[PDB]
Amino acid sequence: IWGESGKLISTTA
């Protein structure tokens, strides 16, 4: 996962 701090979006492989 790349870019996950606050907003619930991680879906990244």
Side-chain angles (χ1 to χ4, degrees):
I1 49 73
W2 303 304
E4 182 163 42
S5 184
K7 190 182 178 181
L8 197 175
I9 41 70
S10 237
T11 303
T12 297

